[PDB]
Symmetry: D2
Subunit: 387 residues, 4 copies
Amino acid sequence: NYAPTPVDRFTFGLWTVGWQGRDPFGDATRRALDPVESVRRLAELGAHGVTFHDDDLIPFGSSDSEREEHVKRFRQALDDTGMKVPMATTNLFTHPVFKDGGFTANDRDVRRYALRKTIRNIDLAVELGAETYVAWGGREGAESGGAKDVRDALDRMKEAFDLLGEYVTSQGYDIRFAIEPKPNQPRGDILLPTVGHALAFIERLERPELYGVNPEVGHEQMAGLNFPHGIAQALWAGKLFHIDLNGQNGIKYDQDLRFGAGDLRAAFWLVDLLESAGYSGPRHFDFKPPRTEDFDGVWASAAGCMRNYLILKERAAAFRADPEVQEALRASRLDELARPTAADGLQALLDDRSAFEEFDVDAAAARGMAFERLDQLAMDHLLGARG
Amino acid sequence: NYAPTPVDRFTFGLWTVGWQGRDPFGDATRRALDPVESVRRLAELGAHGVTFHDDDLIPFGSSDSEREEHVKRFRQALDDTGMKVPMATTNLFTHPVFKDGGFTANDRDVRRYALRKTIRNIDLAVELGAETYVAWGGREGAESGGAKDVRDALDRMKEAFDLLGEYVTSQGYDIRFAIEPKPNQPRGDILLPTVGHALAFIERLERPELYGVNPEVGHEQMAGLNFPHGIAQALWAGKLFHIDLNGQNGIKYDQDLRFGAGDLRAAFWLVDLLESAGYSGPRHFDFKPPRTEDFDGVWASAAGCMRNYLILKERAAAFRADPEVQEALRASRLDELARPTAADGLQALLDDRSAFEEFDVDAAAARGMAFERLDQLAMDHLLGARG
Amino acid sequence: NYAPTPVDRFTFGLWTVGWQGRDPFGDATRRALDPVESVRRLAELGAHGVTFHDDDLIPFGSSDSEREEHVKRFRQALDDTGMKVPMATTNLFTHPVFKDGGFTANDRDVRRYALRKTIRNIDLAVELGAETYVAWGGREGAESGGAKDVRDALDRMKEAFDLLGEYVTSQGYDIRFAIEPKPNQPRGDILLPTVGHALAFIERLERPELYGVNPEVGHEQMAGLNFPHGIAQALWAGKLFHIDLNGQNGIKYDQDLRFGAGDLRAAFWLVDLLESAGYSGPRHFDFKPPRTEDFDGVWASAAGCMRNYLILKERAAAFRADPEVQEALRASRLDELARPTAADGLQALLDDRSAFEEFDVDAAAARGMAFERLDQLAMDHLLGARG
Amino acid sequence: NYAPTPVDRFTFGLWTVGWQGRDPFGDATRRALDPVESVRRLAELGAHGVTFHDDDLIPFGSSDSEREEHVKRFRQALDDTGMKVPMATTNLFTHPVFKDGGFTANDRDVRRYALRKTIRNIDLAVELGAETYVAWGGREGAESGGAKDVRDALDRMKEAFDLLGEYVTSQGYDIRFAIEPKPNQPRGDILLPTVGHALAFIERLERPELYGVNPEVGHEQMAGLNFPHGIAQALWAGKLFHIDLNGQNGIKYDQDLRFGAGDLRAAFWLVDLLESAGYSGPRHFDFKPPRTEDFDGVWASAAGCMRNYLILKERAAAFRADPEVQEALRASRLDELARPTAADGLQALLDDRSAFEEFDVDAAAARGMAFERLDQLAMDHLLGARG
Ligand SMILES: [Mg+2]
Ligand SMILES: [Mg+2]
Ligand SMILES: [Mg+2]
Ligand SMILES: [Mg+2]
Ligand SMILES: [Mn+2]
Ligand SMILES: [Mn+2]
Ligand SMILES: [Mn+2]
Ligand SMILES: [Mn+2]
Ligand SMILES: [Mn+2]
Ligand SMILES: [Mn+2]
Ligand SMILES: [Mn+2]
Ligand SMILES: [Mn+2]
Ligand code: NA
Ligand code: NA
Ligand code: NA
Ligand code: NA
Ligand code: NA
Ligand code: NA
Ligand code: NA
Ligand code: NA
């Protein structure tokens, strides 16, 4: 039961199942995986595709001949399995040169290098068929208030993204960009810390249509925010270009638990929203099998990500299709929320005594919302306890 | 020392010093204050002005003759003291009719009433000389996932703000709107939970130039975010129309401590930013004297808000003017952060071997940022411990 | 399905279903309930009993004749329904006299009054058959560092609890005390903020056997802590005298959601622990029906608390009884965790080369824990998705 | 100004200034330091001593001859500088063998090895003159609910600490143990997550007098708790055997900022408490110079830790010595808090009409606490803005 299919579009970063287990306090617990191994194992589990940072696929500093051989082996694995590569990204965070940032490093020479590193990988992403290029500015930020003038940093970040947009336009590429917010870690505070801040920034770019967001479940939850609500705002703006699925158990370090772990009810409401809205992009997992696990546990954790999505999809669909739930949604006036407040227009509203002089506020205030019964139907559907 | 002056533009809500002390668990500890009393006492402390919700100035449900008398007495107090009213707002949160929201209530009749209540108060705000009209949607949100379709709610919120913009345009008013984000409390999650989300929403309004943000120190800190960073993004966007100053000691209920309490170093960096950027709006305090205090403690707490701002202003100015700090800022390459990454343009960057093939990443990575010495100069200046 | 029974021992505070909906920003949305009404309605839902603060049952300031009549009516309702009163508590937080505390108020006269108020209610609790007397010191704490010397406050808190222990001993009462920790709200920081701090304090009382803890799900989660882990430590110490069940959606104000809402997986692990350990006390709900609800929603929310406990009980029992789960627990060495490290004693351990010179650390480090497969079996059992 | 002296007893872990800068996302930015270098540089800054984990001083897996040479070189550096070694600890967290714990690993063979590794290092600590042996159980915990039975884990943790107490007693050593709590990171939840939980656990050990706590500023703040309050409870219990000083900017990953950074006002109240209570132990810094820094920044950050302590010590002493502050403390009844509630005894309290029938609750409730004026005097003293 709950078997993944190609139409599910489940994807995984090479760095997810390939995470060797090094953490702030501990050495690696697993050997490095050849990307070819990961592609073949993920395909066996029913994944649709993989994603990569440049330096996951090609060791940093590789010669041109080494780069060609790494890509050739990877493409053979994709061909052997039918796996796709819908998204790629640049590693602008691991190498010590990026310790103060890539696009917003105080040092101008580093900013220029970061752009050249990204541009090289955009070319590769396009060659592999990627539709989305993600940017997670994990080093853009500060530990102290004097270190980073944020208005200047935002000017540099806009300049960088504008140059990348000029580049893809000039090359005729169809790829689009997705900015991944995170509030903190590894920097004390990271620039564009939430979906909202990223959406606002995009509106000030020269070609805003080329940019959207790649929200990650755990990153919004690291600020205590409601991830389904943030996804709704991204969908409302037309900017949900990609998504990163995982779990996070409260406000703390980025845990990258398998999807469905952490906040299970938020996972249910997320899947309900994505499916109801008809989100058509990859269901991408950015997770880390805990360092307690051997390789069998790695593959079990990856399988669990997909299984949990499929269980939640079933339960959310059953919730929405249940005539008792539809009745409860009407009892709670969800239908009215979807109707315009004043399609009659401003003057008619101003002239409408039913909206002011004749509005019976005490009668309105007496009406219960019936939200608790609706939520208990949702709980019963999630748990398969209807009756 | 540290005496407020009119040019400081310190303002207070009537509901701040007038808070009677009722909390989720406790009855009022202070009697209600007549707004006339608050105006006269705040003027004696050196405040510039006050602000109000409709229902702070005019008891909810007042007749037209009662409304006129309340406003007349208030205007006499303003005239007697020279106090101004730069900002006003609507109470769309206290009355039970607003239990599921004002502009985004599921019930359409409540949404229409909320708009009429706001429009009535915009007229009054303009008559009293206010330049800014704040909206804090404290009831817009949910405790459960099925209760509020967030895409529909955002449609209703946009409709409401668009109607208000049509209204002020039609009346020829110069007032502008400022949206106040908050992540949670009193709703489990509030719509537009951060500065970023509010900035992004504004960009989708029909007349975006009429709307900005009113960020509150403690509200961004309730999501663990960096308040100076968020203010910087608002300033970068040209949208810091007003600000609410207070303190907050971590992630928890909205404490509304006096300004300077809570995160003192964030208060220092905030004042540094506002003064450096030349923010010209009111320095408005949205705080609550703790319910442990009698009226003498109320006025001491209000005086402390202004005193702390003035101390921090002095210390931040001394930091920026110190030649040793200016040298440290150059050592940390803050000057380079402010210079364009690639004013030579994309093609020149692509052709520049110094940005890729000839970039010595290991030499760049070896350079220290000297951020710790800069931050200790900042600490020494804040504490008046230079030497 | 999932029908409460008397052996379930589900109990509710009068102040839970009776909460009128006043919050930091909003007026009451529901009329006050007569305790007689609440007893009869809760009995109809299958509750076992109720609990009370003094001032929930007897209006503050009542005459002796008024007190007798309120108690007589309440006892008739208990008799009419078969409901029990297993626990009572004192309200040392609502009245303005307690604004700086009860037992740890700086003013000595208030501390003495708080003790007399509590002693009066202990007598009543015993008359109604309560086995546990809860103390939640919601006003014990501070908003500022100079206001409360915590060593002195702990001396006063120990003095108060020691006097209460002397009182019950002197009267021959069998009741025991349970301290309810909370980290903050309504005070900026509350003394004894977690289960651990309360357990540590109890060990320094003169008669430690008379005191245990009353942990509340949401209060531990307001510090981001793992509630099942804290309950395990209380059980390990022999101190889980009572428990408060509810939900909490992250680190924020005390939400008091119905049980099962908030952190659903933590609720599952809690129920698993209570049932596995054979906890025999009341399953008490300290929750608040949201102020959006009318009375039908109040009773739906209360019913939901009990339903969710019963669903989780079924799923946790099925998890523990599944031979595949038992095999996975052995694969993860949960059996070994339960066996002594060195029952052979210290000298034998020191002499055992297999524990040092001959311990193959690399072979040990290669063994996977298989925790991910175990956790996915737990998820499958919770969701009823085994297969 | 603000020059460290030997009587200040400032100490640093080898792993602090020696941190190479590897974080969850980034490679090392600094070369490894020879412990001899760190001892000599810290001495030049005015430090009193250093501390070590076994594997900071002796590379894991060293032969006996290698161990002797590493210790000999270290002792020569201590002799050359006059630096002391007041505390040592075991690394039971870095090596992959400890991925599920040391003392509470599910695998019994690992638990036994962890004990033998610790015992070997206790012998070395004693030879170097350490008075305190710290245990930070960073791997004791879980990411999932089924992985760790917490009652069994607490049994294993008690067994381990009891064996260590038997060991030091049997050898006649004067060293004592200090348990360092942390709520999470690197495990999803860590056992003994706060000072309170650790204090409670100690009370159940066989020889409780041998064990205390080593609280760390940032670790309590990772649960949003008040660090000065927790230190007060440890002092009240007689259990503050050692302390770790650093900074932490909210609830997030363990930042280990230099002391005084993060929550500056909490740092002020901490220093006030330690000095007022006469804490006589080391002022130990467990911090990490940010990975943005070169070695000059490392030493600047270490110097800043000590400088900030000394500034805060001066300001707290001036606060307590100011006759205006002493008057404000009396106005706020801090003197009354320190006096017994009922030294007259229980019967006298029960017979005292002034404590109940004749207590004027409304007159008592009208008295203001004057806490805001007291706190503003504290702010003025911290900032050196008296006047
Ligand atoms: Mg629709
Ligand atoms: Mg500039
Ligand atoms: Mg057992
Ligand atoms: Mg004293
Ligand atoms: Mn992440
Ligand atoms: Mn991601
Ligand atoms: Mn606020
Ligand atoms: Mn505000
Ligand atoms: Mn609660
Ligand atoms: Mn409770
Ligand atoms: Mn730490
Ligand atoms: Mn430490
Ligand atoms: Na700039
Ligand atoms: Na979209
Ligand atoms: Na709509
Ligand atoms: Na602006
Ligand atoms: Na005392
Ligand atoms: Na127990
Ligand atoms: Na055991
Ligand atoms: Na002590």
